[PDB]
Design a protein around this ligand. Structure first.
Ligand SMILES: [Mg+2]
Length: 460
């Protein structure tokens, strides 16, 4: 039975509002409701992997696993296997997979980050899971960020703490945070970004929602505007939103938004908002297509509606050659020409590079670059033709063209990374000098760029 080249992944996020779910939640897993919904002809086709994030979840892990497995069994007639479950306070992530995938999944990791300081520490944060699926690394983050329309900067700070401190994926990738450790990273949750309009426009906003006219609301969505200004979620994607705001509803109906300030809200308004989101980041030139992104209409126990998203995601095999793993393949090489890093740092130390990739036996350190000043004040670190020739473990182009090289630029003085990026080996040609480029980030913020040329030799 052949190994898959693509799988489908279900992501769900639901703030349950500390209430038990209703008896039937299958519309969630079927991507039915509002927005970009799944075709009815697919209803009996199971996704390969289901990743379920909850916030304000009142259930035990056992209780929620019961409900999830029974719901998927009812839909698909398949008994899913539990890959992982992890809970921080009332924030939870469950990963379920088809039983045929049990021996394709390995290296399962879980972690959590608590976001608060002093008073703020004690209910917000994130949980995550990572694993390998054959040759492909997958990461998943469910976060419950700070509440309140006035707190978008605190949400952005929560995001950066989660990014920095969530310990998932391959610990040998020591310069890299979760935003570079995975072929595909999915980050979802009750992110709590709000529609930033005046509170006296509440009834106008509800009218727009009833007309399914979201454009003038989305133009004020804090997550879209902060992402456009590069304040958060740099280099992530989100599908277009075509479903009504998922917060804040009166419970047991979806006919009414409960926006008014009350003692229970700390005298805050909750104007209708897209609190509940799914974003992703995949390595360059890997197949990833969003197939659905929407909200259910028939699950009403919470003041939030569940959100679903589904993806078709490219995956690769666990390649074995006569040579690697366990040795290099002399017929393969990776070479770099006319390369240089442009850094935003105001510092003047020497820099070197590290190249990290699963196609190498271990990471490779370059010689120091030569610092120059750019025309507009920048630090330019020139490597020219000085970068090492990388020796992949497998030369077969059906393996090597699917790989990626992670790059860190490190201070010689401190051995700290000043920037991380990723180069695809999915080239237009082999044995040909071709341009390469990545932005460089550190703690998820832009710190520079790396560009130059690559020349890849494969056994063809
Ligand atoms: Mg709540």
């Amino acid at each position: 039975q052949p190994e898959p080249d693509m799988i489908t992944i279900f992501i769900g996020t639901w703030n349950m509002g500390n209430a038990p779910p209703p008896k039937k939640i299958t519309s969630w897993f079927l991507s039915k409701g509002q927005g970009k919904t799944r075709d009815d002809s697919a209803d009996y086709i199971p996704h390969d992997i289901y990743v379920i994030g909850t916030q304000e979840d009142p259930l035990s892990e056992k209780e929620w696993l019961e409900i999830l497995k029974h719901s998927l069994q009812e839909i698909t007639s398949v008994t899913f296997k539990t890959v992982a479950i992890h809970t921080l306070w009332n924030i939870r992530i469950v990963v379920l997979a088809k039983p045929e995938h049990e021996n394709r999944i390995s290296h399962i990791c879980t972690d959590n980050v608590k976001t608060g300081i002093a008073n703020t520490l004690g209910n917000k944060g994130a949980v995550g899971v990572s694993f390998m699926f054959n040759g492909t690394s997958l990461g998943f983050v469910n976060s419950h960020l700070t509440s309140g329309s006035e707190k978008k900067l605190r949400r952005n700070q929560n995001y950066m703490n989660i990014l920095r401190f969530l310990a998932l994926g391959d610990k040998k990738l020591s310069p890299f945070n979760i935003t570079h450790r995975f072929t595909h990273l999915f980050w979802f949750g009750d992110l709590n970004y709000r529609v930033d309009l005046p509170t006296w426009e509440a009834e106008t906003i509800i009218q727009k929602i009833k007309q399914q006219q979201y454009a003038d609301l989305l133009s004020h969505d804090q997550l879209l505007t902060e992402r456009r200004e590069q304040k958060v979620f740099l280099h992530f994607e989100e599908e277009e939103i075509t479903f009504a705001p998922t917060y804040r509803f009166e419970r047991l109906t979806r006919d009414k938004y409960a926006y008014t300030k009350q003692k229970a809200t700390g005298m805050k308004y909750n104007l209708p908002s897209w609190c509940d989101r799914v974003l992703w980041k995949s390595y360059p030139l890997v197949h990833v297509v969003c197939q659905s992104y929407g909200s259910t209409s028939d699950i009403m126990t919470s003041d939030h509606s569940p959100v679903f998203a589904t993806f078709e995601a490219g995956v690769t095999s666990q390649f074995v050659s006569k040579n690697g793993p366990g040795t290099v393949d002399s017929q393969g090489q990776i070479e770099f020409l006319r390369c240089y890093a442009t850094l935003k740092t105001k510092s003047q130390t020497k820099f070197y590079l590290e190249f990290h990739s699963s196609c190498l036996e271990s990471f490779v350190k370059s010689q120091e670059g030569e610092n120059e000043e750019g025309s507009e004040g920048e630090l330019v670190v020139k490597f020219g033709e000085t970068l090492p020739k990388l020796k992949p473990i497998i030369s077969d182009p059906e393996y090597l063209l699917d790989q990626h090289i992670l790059i860190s630029i490190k201070s010689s003085d401190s051995d700290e990374s000043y920037g991380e990026g990723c180069i695809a080996l999915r080239l237009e040609a082999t044995e040909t000098q071709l341009p390469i480029y990545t932005p460089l980030t550190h703690h998820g913020e832009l710190t520079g760029h790396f560009q130059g040329e690559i020349k890849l030799q494969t056994s063809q």
